[PDB]
């Protein structure tokens, strides 16, 4: 192994509260809700612990972002559901699912991206006129990696923690050699 463990930065999860919601009521009666229907059609709600952001839609569907663990994402999602319930809606906690996970790493050595896009062209996209990182589209596991000249790596597109660790253990010998 590399001896390097990628750190989870963000978890995106979803949940169906199983009932239709009046967003005007949520915005008026909650302290932590932000609602500008002309700008964006959902309520933006925030809680302090776990420090996250939820988008609540009039359909009853909800998106939870910003958590650092899959456990924190579930606890935060349940807290938003409990806030909505106390506001007078018959909210349920249905079909909770982790949709995306973002991890980050540092290999602590510089990377010649101009060389990596030649040896691994079938997975690599590097256009420095557009973005400083090399976009690596790994097939197994299906993960997108943003590789920078600094040796710092961003891993995204994972449904489970293991896919982040697997993708990093796969990229490490490619970056070292």
């Amino acid at each position: 192994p590399s001896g390097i463990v990628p750190q989870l930065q963000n978890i995106v999860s979803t949940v169906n509260l199983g009932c239709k919601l009046d967003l005007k009521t949520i915005a008026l009666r909650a302290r932590n809700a932000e609602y500008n229907p002309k700008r964006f059609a959902a309520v933006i709600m925030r809680i302090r612990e776990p420090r996250t952001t939820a988008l609540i839609f009039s359909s009853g569907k909800m998106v939870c972002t910003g958590a650092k663990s899959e456990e924190q994402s579930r606890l935060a999602a349940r807290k938003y559901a409990r806030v909505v319930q106390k506001l007078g809606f018959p909210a349920k906690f249905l079909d909770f699912k982790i949709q995306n996970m973002v991890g980050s790493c540092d290999v602590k050595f510089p990377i010649r991206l101009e060389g990596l896009v030649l040896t691994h062209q079938q997975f690599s996209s590097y256009e420095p006129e557009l973005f400083p990182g090399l976009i690596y589209r790994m097939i197994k596991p299906r993960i997108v990696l943003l590789i920078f000249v600094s040796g710092k790596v961003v891993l995204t597109g994972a449904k489970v923690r293991a896919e982040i660790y697997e993708a990093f253990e796969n990229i490490y010998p490619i970056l070292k050699g």
Binding site: Q7, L28, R29, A30, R31, N32, I47, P50, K68, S69, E70, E71, Q72, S73, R74, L75, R78, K79, R82, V83, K86, L87, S104, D106, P110, R112, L113, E114, V117, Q121, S125, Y126, E127, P128, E129, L130, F131, P132, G133, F148, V149, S150, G151
Partner: protein
């Protein structure tokens, strides 16, 4: 399709405006046609169909090492670079193409030759006039040095060449050109000054100062970003030897690495959360407005 025929006409007009060789037009027309077969392209906005014209011409140019920049295409097409970015990435992915990278050697020749410093004029005094071949040869050596010393990777390429052209020009007559700034130089050479060109200049001067430290007779002179300029000729004569020697000792790394202050990134503490713990009523009630807060808000919106 009326939008396809209009697109193919625009592709041909762009190639003629750019004065591209005759074979390029056909290849770019064929890429636009190949693109139109996909439903994702057919369903796109008329703005995306306008930048698609440019994507197809750029791919053709990239394959023939024609040094066309994405910024130059967007300027000619009066297009947004962000709209061009997303369309180019989509069409490369869609047509499953291995598009070669921009050829820096060819861009140095084209861009450097546009610098109007080869003839004297009221705005270009005699002491500022330089030989085109001496300029190209030294600019190229400074662009290769920037590439070898990690100043090009992940950065826009044109500001690197602007900074290398200015340093080549100054180093060819140091006594009379050191008073001239990068901004004054771009103005008289009649070239736009790219915003990152000042940062690239300073990074390139810092790289030449590290090389100067490898030569005992230059190390003892305690050179600075101003006094190093008259020795650039001597440093480039031995660039291969000095670069190997500089990497061998210590430290020569991408500027974004040296240095980052926040050495520890896992600032959030390790959690013992299970996601199943009880959620008390007091924990939730803090996120609810009181009947008074509600009345005061309602009255304020009435």
């Amino acid at each position: 399709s009326r939008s396809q025929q209009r697109g193919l006409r625009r592709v041909r007009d762009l190639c003629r405006v750019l004065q591209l060789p005759p074979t390029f037009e056909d290849t770019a027309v064929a890429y636009y046609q190949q693109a139109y077969r996909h439903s994702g392209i057919r369903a796109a906005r008329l703005q995306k169909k306008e930048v698609l014209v440019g994507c197809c011409v750029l791919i053709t140019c990239r394959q023939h090492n024609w040094p066309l920049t994405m910024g130059a295409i967007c300027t000619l097409l009066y297009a947004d670079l962000d709209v061009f970015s997303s369309t180019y990435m989509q069409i490369v992915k869609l047509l499953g193409l291995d598009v070669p990278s921009l050829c820096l050697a060819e861009l140095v020749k084209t861009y450097c030759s546009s610098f109007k410093l080869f003839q004297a004029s009221p705005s270009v005094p005699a002491k500022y006039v330089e030989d085109k071949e001496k300029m190209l040869s030294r600019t190229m050596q400074l662009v290769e040095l920037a590439n070898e010393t990690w100043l090009v990777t992940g950065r826009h390429p044109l500001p690197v060449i602007t900074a290398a052209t200015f340093l080549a020009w100054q180093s060819l007559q140091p006594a009379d050109r050191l008073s001239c700034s990068l901004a004054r130089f771009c103005k008289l050479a009649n070239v736009d000054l790219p915003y990152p060109a000042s940062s690239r200049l300073q990074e390139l001067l810092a790289v030449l100062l590290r090389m100067a430290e490898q030569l005992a007779w230059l190390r003892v002179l305690r050179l600075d970003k101003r006094s190093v300029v008259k020795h650039i000729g001597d440093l480039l004569q031995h660039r291969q030897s000095l670069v190997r020697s500089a990497f061998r000792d210590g430290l020569l790394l991408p500027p974004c690495m040296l240095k980052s202050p926040k050495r520890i990134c896992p600032v959030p503490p390790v959690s013992t959360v299970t996601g199943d713990e009880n959620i008390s009523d007091s924990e939730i009630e803090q996120y609810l407005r009181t009947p008074q807060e509600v009345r005061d808000f309602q009255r304020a919106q009435a």
